[model samples]
Target: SVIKPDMKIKLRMEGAVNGHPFAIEGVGLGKPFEGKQSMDLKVKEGGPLPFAYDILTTVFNRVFAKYPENIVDYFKQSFPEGYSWERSMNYEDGGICNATNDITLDGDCYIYEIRFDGVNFPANGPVMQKRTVKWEPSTEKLYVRDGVLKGDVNMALSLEGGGHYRCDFKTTYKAKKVVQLPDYHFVDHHIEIKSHDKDYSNVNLHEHAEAHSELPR
Candidate 1:
């Protein structure tokens, strides 16, 4: 595997995971490894990218496909999902209300801590509700921990009621592994992936997909 310009490389998902060390087609010994989970495929940088940003063809999806379910699986496991019990946020409002959290699931005995300094506190500002807990699309560390889920969570209620103060959030999930948040809707498959393109050079990597092109040879 002598880093050359026009070399042929072959990679199989199952093969790589099962210890069939990746090899350069008709070349030398198998290169070491590239973390089975990420199955990274690399080649000498000599030309433009293989796939276009605007149009992702079926063949492109075939190699680097991530189902809509896969996308949600990743989100439900991150941040406030797994790391929120100890999660915290700034007053960002630069006021007296310091947001703290506690769990009160169908029943977790929550310990909410919302401190409003009387001196600087606005006379007409709002206050937060003490109820509301639970992070959807839950997981292991996501549960209300040790009878004391510390710090602040997405304040289920950032206020008690003022018709003048409030907070907002955008996240929820279930085990079905489907997309539910608007944050990830921009690149949904139905609108983002196209089946084919006519004359664009980068539209279809037909040759690259099957090793029938010169760039990969």
Candidate 2:
């Protein structure tokens, strides 16, 4: 197949207000995350440690394994020609937010990213939901994450909209044995979007990746 040399891949996470579009977030990578949390907590308080290359390799494998359809075929179809997976970075943290691969198989490299958002839930609210799980030795791998989903969802929505409208969503599936990725890459992990609009989102993935890679030890 004749391949195009240049291609563009864009991703967006948005929310609508009265049917009007709000960009909320955008990313140009394989897969990205979408959530938010406190900014004041200190991530690491110790000296240098071994880089988790094994864990990183595991993450890549798990990601591809879990979402083979979305990662492999979708990226290839989107950029059918040839492209390098550039490292993604956050708008604020001055570090690489998303992993990248300069190498490619076939015509494209399966790129992925993680995203974060504020205001997903209210800061102070009536209900706070937390989950804890324990691996069952008897079942040999079985475990349980105990939490109330329906009530938590209602509480979150109520806190978000100030209890204006009753919101409801269904459980697509129960938690299963899946590849879980770590959130320990603190330095260049979090990306902050200034606005919902793409123009003003002010995200510069290239620059951020470069800066992150050049951080002092």
Candidate 3:
């Protein structure tokens, strides 16, 4: 089944950082996929600070980077998320960061091995400033069935500043179809470099519930 109006997806992600466990929960509500491929999702903040930072960065990148031109069609194909980081302390010193993914299929699951590599941060007075400020290697295994996705991911980063950061994530989501688009507060903050002439009406809801109940406390 394809994504349709009134469809809702609940996601729960949990993982470990340096052996310390952490988790996050969220929900995605589908809207009409006519003019714009828009969905309403909410995520709660609770986890290791580093993991939280990375997760937020990924979320912002996905949402702000660009909306899928064809929502239904986009989901029909498999796509991997990409991320990068760059910083400059001065014109003479800086670092480059990049991450790539290798995907394979095992039965009904898609296995992903994401490799993160980057130049060490430029020498700076603060030890924290010189740590692994670039990338961390990770992996994910996702299963898709009947328009539903369930997955687990794990990643670890080593810092020159003297510590290791890691995370383990699990997620479960299912999509539905809706006739009208819901009001996503964050959409107002979206930077629109292109324009869509299609007229759309918005629906407002008072509260959205947490969809994943099996997540670790």
Ranking by TM-score: 3, 2, 1
Over 4 Å off, model 3: 32-74, 77-217
TM-score of 2: 0.20
lDDT of 3: 0.29
What TM-score number comes out for model 3?
A: 0.27
Per-residue alpha-carbon lDDT of candidate 1 for residues 94-163, written as tens digits (9 for 90 to 100): 3222112221111111112211111132323222221212111111112222332111123222222322
Off by over 4 Å in 1: 1-70, 74-82, 85-120, 128-163, 166-217
lDDT values for all models: 0.20, 0.21, 0.29
For residues 64-135, could you state the per-residue lDDT of candidate 2 as single tens digits? 211222222222232323232322222121211233333223433322232212222222222112111111
In the range 151-172, model 3's lDDT, one tens digit per residue, is 4445344556665645444443
Reference-based TM-score, model 1: 0.19
Model 2 residue 171 lDDT? 16
Q: What is the C-alpha local distance difference test score of candidate 2?
A: 0.21
Better structure of 1 and 2 per TM-score: 2
Question: Lowest-scoring 10 consecutive residues by lDDT in candidate 1?
Answer: 27-36
